[PDB]
């Protein structure tokens, strides 16, 4: 087995086709299914894996009560083959209430953050063993992508943030080789707040589209030079911004050096990736809540901040159905690097009081050069009957 280099072109995306759906919540009404949140998808060379941060309990379990709390010592990184629901046999790969993982072509890197809020520890587990660890540097919720890292030529890059949730924070880009932190780069550029980065290999570098929880409803971009460890940061130009909350399309504006200061506070983990000067991006259909999910291409959306020309729109989750975190992951095809994305389908508390627990299902779509129709793939759990 050789290290992944992702040294193939991004093949043309006409849109995205359905790939996988775990149906976890629906199954949980009639089976032992983990309570989860912050899911993501990452693939070794042969097959894709679904990850999620368990809450140390199943849904039909007295412990599923009060699972809205996002940091407990019982949260663990769940790992299954994509499409296998988080049943009781699910392997907990590490203790984490924040995590990222990539496969470098040889083994799985898991970056796992747990411990006290202001005193967190990031454990780096590579090929099934703890190789390295770093302590919170800002002592305010050390946290990472909640999506797959990007691992090029055996050098894995993970974006990790520590500091103010909705203010200036200290973001660093760690470079990991076989689980060992060989270099740490501070965030550089114009991105003013970076969380929950959705990163993909863009050979020779890595490109991350992240969450600005402080001042931007436009998403920050972080470009990572894996060779010299240089960092540059910016925002997605697209006038159709991808964060939630955000202003309506008519009144929204973007700036691909600075946050747009439009409903900038708070946000959601999302993703975007460039296609020449265009940008493929997904976002909640609802501008202020995590309801529905759509993807589209913004013509010149990667270079022209005034561009609101949208095309190739696809509804992934209807606007009446709940959405959540979404993130990118990349899959090496025969001759290209395909872009895929998952959507977290959050159900339960606080928004839905019919149940005491907070969990999610996932739906996974993959870029296609072919053709596709329309549909909607929400969670579909009837919480009233649960």
């Amino acid at each position: 087995a050789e290290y992944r280099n992702w040294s193939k072109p991004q093949c043309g995306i006409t849109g995205f086709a359905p790939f996988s759906k775990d149906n976890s919540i629906r199954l949980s009404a009639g089976g032992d299914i983990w309570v989860t949140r912050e899911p993501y998808v990452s693939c070794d060379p042969d097959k894709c894996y679904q990850f999620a941060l368990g809450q140390g309990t199943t849904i039909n379990n007295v412990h599923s009560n009060n699972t809205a709390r996002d940091r407990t010592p019982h949260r663990t990184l769940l790992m299954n083959e994509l499409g296998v629901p988080f049943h009781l046999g699910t392997k907990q790969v590490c203790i984490a209430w924040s995590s990222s993982s990539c496969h470098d072509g040889k083994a799985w890197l898991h970056v796992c953050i747990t411990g006290d809020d202001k005193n967190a520890t990031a454990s780096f587990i590579y090929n099934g063993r703890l190789v390295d660890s770093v302590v919170s540097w800002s002592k305010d919720i050390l946290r990472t992508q909640e999506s797959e890292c990007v691992c090029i030529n055996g050098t894995c890059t993970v974006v990790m943030t520590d500091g103010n949730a909705t203010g200036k924070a200290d973001t660093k880009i760690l470079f990991i080789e076989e689980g060992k932190i060989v270099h740490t780069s501070k965030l550089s550029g114009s991105a003013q707040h970076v969380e929950e980065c959705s990163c993909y290999p863009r050979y020779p570098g890595v490109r991350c589209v992240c969450r600005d929880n402080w001042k931007g409803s436009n998403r920050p971009i972080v470009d990572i030079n894996i060779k010299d460890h240089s960092i540059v940061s910016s925002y997605v130009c697209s006038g159709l911004v991808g964060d939630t909350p955000r202003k309506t399309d008519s009144s929204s504006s973007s700036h691909c050096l600075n946050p747009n200061n439009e409903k900038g506070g708070h946000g959601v983990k999302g993703w975007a990736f460039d296609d020449g000067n265009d940008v493929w991006m997904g976002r909640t259909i609802n501008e202020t809540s995590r309801l529905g999910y759509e993807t589209f291409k913004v013509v010149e959306g990667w270079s022209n901040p005034k561009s609101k020309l949208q095309i190739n729109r696809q509804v992934i989750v209807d606007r009446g159905d709940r959405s959540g975190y979404s993130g990118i992951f990349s899959v090496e095809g025969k001759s290209c690097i395909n872009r895929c994305f998952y959507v977290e389908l959050i159900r339960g508390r606080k928004e839905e009081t019919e149940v005491l627990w907070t969990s999610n299902s996932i739906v996974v779509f993959c870029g296609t050069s072919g053709t596709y129709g329309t549909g909607s793939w929400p969670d579909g759990a009837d919480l009233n009957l649960m």
Partner: antibody
Amino acid sequence: GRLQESGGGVVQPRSLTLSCAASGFTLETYTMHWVRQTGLEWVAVSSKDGNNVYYRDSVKGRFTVSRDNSKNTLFLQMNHLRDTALYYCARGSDPDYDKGWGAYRNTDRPSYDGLDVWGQGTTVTV
Amino acid sequence: IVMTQSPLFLSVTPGESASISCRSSQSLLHSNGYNYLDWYLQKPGQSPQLLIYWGSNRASGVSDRFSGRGSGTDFTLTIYNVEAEDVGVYYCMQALQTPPWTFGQGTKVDI
């Protein structure tokens, strides 16, 4: 981080200005509270930017809390003093942003810091 | 929110445990799953120091002898292996519904 209150003293049943100087950290970084001890009784709070305040009901209209982040100084302008207590200046414990300003408690990664730094307190006797 | 502490006075033999209860008139559990309840210790002649925040999170440098527990309206501060340095007044403070920030009456701990 260290806080040092000042301006306390004997005042006649008149006005008095309490000042709280921050050293080792920037006042702009923290919500600032005034807490008085006659047990502990929260008096007033000043937002990080110095543009928002909350007051204890019994001091509303009498006490004015302000700050100068450039000077790293928190102020409590006390008027119509009736209020005898040891007045502490403490940082942290942001209110809920959903009520106008403070921390975003509904974000995915909510954070909270208590009153982790207090001054020694300045005595005010009226 | 009214913050009721009990007992108001506690006598602790050195090396044994001490528990202080604190009840709020309303639940301090936020929808984000965290109980906005702090514990503060005012040692004799000193300013208050944060012991616990969010119900069970020890502050920086606080001995793990101090343990905050509970949720909703009922919270307990347990001082394990009490020592003479632990004497003073322990105040619980709710930070859920503010303003005002409201403290408990304070439990006085002595040897």
